[PDB]
Design brief:
This is part of a larger assembly, with chains A (about 70 residues), B (about 140 residues), C (about 180 residues) and D (about 60 residues). Chain B is α+β, with helices and mostly antiparallel strands and about 140 residues long. Chain B has one domain. Chain B is built from four helices and five strands; from the N terminus they run H-H-H-E-E-E-E-E-H. Chain B is elongated and about 75 Å long. The N and C termini of chain B lie far apart (about 75 Å). Helices cover about 45% and strands about 0% of the residues of chain C. Chain C is built from seven helices and no strands. In chain C, helix 2 packs antiparallel against helix 3 and helix 5 packs across helix 6. Chain C has about 180 residues and is an all-alpha fold. With about 60 residues, chain D is mostly helical. Chain D starts with 11 loop residues before the first helix and ends in a 16-residue tail after the last helix. The chains are: A mainly alpha (about 70), B alpha+beta (about 140), C mainly alpha (about 180), D mainly alpha (about 60). At the B-D interface, strand 1 of B face helix 1 of D. The structure holds magnesium ion (MG) (39 copies). One magnesium ion (MG) binds next to helix 3 of chain A. The site of one magnesium ion has 3 residues of chain A, from helix 3. Chain B binds three RNA strands through helix 1, helix 2, helix 3, strand 1 and strand 2. Chain D: One of its GO terms (molecular function) is structural constituent of ribosome. Chain D: Keywords: Cytoplasm, Phosphoprotein, Ribonucleoprotein, Ribosomal protein. Chain D: Belongs to the eukaryotic ribosomal protein eS30 family. Chain D: It comes from Saccharomyces cerevisiae (strain ATCC 204508 / S288c).
RNA sequence: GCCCGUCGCUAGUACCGAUUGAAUGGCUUAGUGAGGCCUCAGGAUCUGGGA
RNA sequence: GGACUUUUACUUUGAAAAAAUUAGAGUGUUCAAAGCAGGCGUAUUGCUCGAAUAUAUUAGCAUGGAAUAAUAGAAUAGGACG
RNA sequence: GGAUAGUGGCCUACCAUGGUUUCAACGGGUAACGGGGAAUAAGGGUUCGAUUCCGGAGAGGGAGCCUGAGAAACGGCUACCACAUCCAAGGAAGGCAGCAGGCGCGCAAAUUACCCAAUCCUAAUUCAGGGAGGUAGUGACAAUAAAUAACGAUACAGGGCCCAUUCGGGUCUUGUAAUUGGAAUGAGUACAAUGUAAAUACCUUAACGAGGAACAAUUGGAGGGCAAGUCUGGUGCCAGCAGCCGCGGUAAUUCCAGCUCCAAUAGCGUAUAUUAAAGUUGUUGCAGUUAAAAAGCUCGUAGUUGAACUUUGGGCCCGGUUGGCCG
């Protein structure tokens, strides 16, 4: 088998110059998994419908629950 | 020299003269006049799909005596009407009026096949299946 | 938007479809070198065909023209390299000669048979495609491998497989599993 | 020509030739082995040379 | 022996043809003319003549 | 630096010139279509060959040729040199 | 002069009468985006290029324009035209020739999946974003490699060959065999490691995985062109075949089948187009008395073409590149 190798001068240096998927393979970093790539996109686009923080819009839309 | 120019500057005359005379080429003239696209029941395309109007029994040319089973088909993209042959023994039993069929040429560059007068096309499929398969009985005609 | 993967085909087919002499001529070759295809002959004809074309061309250039000298030399050394072109006839007017059989003679298929080691061109096929016979420690399973002169000494069974030590093999071992399970405990 | 000839008889013969089933036979080798068998047939052992040669003779 | 044309049958193609016939597409007269831009004004309001 | 130059074709050599494709060199992708890699050691602290060349024409540019084929010249001398 | 970033009839004012054309203007057609290129291999050519790269143009159709260095921008706005969605009928909103997906059209073309790990692009920026792009799925578009078997023993049969007065078989194998013999291997299934962003496949490789009931090759053809039957059964100018020539009306070498045989083979047939064959478009290189073809005749402009002659001969030097015989 032929491959490729790297040896860092320190473990501080690997953990900072290594691609993060690689650190994952080894056990030096946690796979911080997240929403689907397109679940994320959809959250971005919903969020674009709002201008400002939002909570202003929660209360105003709470008034609607009277009309 | 009989009859062409030979001069070193007679290039134009020599091209024009050629252009003029290419129109005697049967293939060339059809290509440029666009005969395909203009007349001719298919678009100029390899096959065409149509609808079966009636089943004909075309009587064969001499010295041959036979009834050559055929179909009048109305081309879908066209409404152009066409009669086509239904190759092999039986196979007319595989079609039916208002059936969809897939016509192809007869390999003769337009032009009728053998002893069948008028006919320039043959059937290749019916209701999405293909005679051949139906004939050799490896497939069955669809529901409706 | 990515560079084309380039390709090209590696054979040519006879213009005359049904020439009885060419057909017998082709079959004989197939039955001599263990081929399965008329294509395995079609292929080589095509290889030859260009090689000759190159050579025809080069020949028209003046003797000792740079391209001729350079590109002719190259082609000759490439042919001598694999044992198609004899040492004596090393000057391209004979690469202009050069037959199909000269090429078929150098396939790993045949070489594997020429020094015993198989005793039938077909045993030679089956062995090759079945992961026995190697060149280095490097196993070769292609019958058309084309044995370069200086590897001819190195055609031999592989360290793996039977025939080359390693282990007998699941079809035999399966029997030795009926030897010790019927006659013993 | 006439264009409304009978149609009754479509498939006449195929429907009235009597079926006979294909007969179970040895399997022929495929691939290289088949060219091999062709070679020994045509050239190695040979068969007949009644004048010249034949490939599909019957009652010769 | 070969063979010509009218006349009669079936089927196919293209021509002519009242309908001042029909359809699509590209330009286009004349008339009407949205809109933004530029410009003469205007001045809700809002400042130090200007916005 | 000044002062003045009949006008063309043809041919040569060369510059300017994208890559990919094509032709083609080198290299054993296991073979091959490909790819532009790869190959040597102290395989424990590194050594090293590459990634060529050809074609690229009509036109424009630049140089050499002066055959072939054109153009212009002095005859109301308003000719040529000083 | 105005306008432009700026030249310019670009526009305006004054003035003039010019500009292009048989060396084909102008107009029409194009089922026309241009190029690098593709197909076809004596050469000369013929045909094709929507399409991985360069250039141009467009975002349903037209026009207008805001921002901005840059747009006459459409995943920006404005208007009109055409489509078209929501409604409480008051109104409001949309532009897939991006990715995927649907309808329609048709002979004709795939997943509403995964990722920024590579390649690179952008931003205030190592970090965020990227349906650019990469990954897999669909996929016999094209292209490459090439499994469907290999070896012995036996049973007669041979041709060899030494002998043959005459049995014959006995060794060197030619091989057709209805009992046989053990070996081999991946197609697949699958620990594991490898692969990968994570998966999948490949490359590795434990355990499994071949005797005919497979793990069982096809597609066309067998009168000629054209490689392969005058076998057998069926039909009886019917059914059907046949690119073309031709077969079929009762012993069909051609149809429908069985048998056997041929060709190419993980591929082979058919249709349409084009190229070669085609010296049947002819520059190379055609033909024109009678086969298709010299205008009834002469003049003649454009066009093509157009006799010979003008520094040749002789002398001297210089330095190159092959090749000989010597080295
Ligand atoms: Mg995201
Ligand atoms: Mg935000
Ligand atoms: Mg005519
Ligand atoms: Mg006839
Ligand atoms: Mg009819
Ligand atoms: Mg040049
Ligand atoms: Mg290059
Ligand atoms: Mg002016
Ligand atoms: Mg005028
Ligand atoms: Mg003209
Ligand atoms: Mg167009
Ligand atoms: Mg074009
Ligand atoms: Mg293009
Ligand atoms: Mg188009
Ligand atoms: Mg644009
Ligand atoms: Mg659209
Ligand atoms: Mg308009
Ligand atoms: Mg726009
Ligand atoms: Mg855009
Ligand atoms: Mg309301
Ligand atoms: Mg889309
Ligand atoms: Mg869009
Ligand atoms: Mg398709
Ligand atoms: Mg990112
Ligand atoms: Mg930070
Ligand atoms: Mg994507
Ligand atoms: Mg199989
Ligand atoms: Mg089996
Ligand atoms: Mg068959
Ligand atoms: Mg024959
Ligand atoms: Mg009979
Ligand atoms: Mg018969
Ligand atoms: Mg038959
Ligand atoms: Mg073929
Ligand atoms: Mg010439
Ligand atoms: Mg002729
Ligand atoms: Mg005549
Ligand atoms: Mg005359
Ligand atoms: Mg002259």
């Amino acid at each position: 088998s032929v491959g490729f190798g790297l040896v860092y001068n320190s473990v501080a240096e690997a953990k900072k110059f290594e691609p993060t998927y690689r650190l994952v393979r080894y056990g030096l970093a946690e796979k911080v998994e997240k929403a689907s790539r397109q679940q994320r996109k959809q959250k971005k686009n919903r969020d674009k419908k709002i201008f400002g923080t939002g909570k202003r819009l929660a209360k105003k839309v709470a008034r609607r629950n009277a009309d | 020299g009989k009859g062409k120019p030979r001069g070193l500057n007679s290039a134009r005359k020599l091209r024009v003269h050629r252009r003029n005379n290419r129109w005697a080429e049967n293939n060339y003239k059809k290509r440029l006049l666009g005969t395909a696209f203009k007349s001719s029941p298919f678009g100029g395309s390899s096959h065409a799909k149509g609808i079966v109007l009636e089943k004909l029994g075309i009587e064969s040319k001499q010295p041959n005596s036979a009834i050559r089973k055929c179909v009048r088909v109305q081309l879908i993209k066209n409404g152009k009407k066409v009669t086509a042959f239904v190759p092999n023994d039986g196979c007319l039993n595989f079609v039916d009026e208002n059936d969809e069929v897939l016509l192809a040429g007869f390999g003769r560059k337009g032009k009728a096949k053998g002893d069948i007068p008028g006919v320039r096309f043959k059937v290749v499929k019916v209701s999405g299946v293909s005679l051949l398969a139906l004939w050799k009985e490896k497939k069955e005609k669809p529901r409706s | 938007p990515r560079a084309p993967r380039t390709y090209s085909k590696t054979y040519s087919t006879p213009k005359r479809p049904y020439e009885s002499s060419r057909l017998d001529a082709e079959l004989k070759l197939a039955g001599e070198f263990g081929l399965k295809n008329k294509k395995e002959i079609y292929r080589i004809s095509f290889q030859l065909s260009k090689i000759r074309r190159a050579a025809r061309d080069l020949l028209t250039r003046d003797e000792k023209d740079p391209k001729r000298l350079f590109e002719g030399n190259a082609l000759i050394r490439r042919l001598v390299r694999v044992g198609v072109l004899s040492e004596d006839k090393k000057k391209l007017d004979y690469v202009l000669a050069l037959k199909v059989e000269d090429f078929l003679e150098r396939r790993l298929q045949t070489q594997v048979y020429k020094l015993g080691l198989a005793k039938s061109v077909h045993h030679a096929r089956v062995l090759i495609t079945q992961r026995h016979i190697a060149v280095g420690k490097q196993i070769v399973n292609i019958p058309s491998f084309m044995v370069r002169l200086d590897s001819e000494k190195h055609i031999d069974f592989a360290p793996t497989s039977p025939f080359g030590g390693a282990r007998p093999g699941r079809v035999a071992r399966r029997n030795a599993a009926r030897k010790a399970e019927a006659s013993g405990e | 020509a006439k264009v409304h000839g009978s149609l009754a008889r479509a498939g006449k013969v195929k429907s009235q030739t009597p079926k006979v089933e294909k007969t179970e036979k040895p399997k022929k080798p495929k691939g290289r082995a088949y060219k091999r068998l062709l070679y020994t047939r045509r050239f190695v052992n040979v068969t007949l040379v009644n004048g010249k040669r034949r490939m599909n003779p019957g009652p010769s």
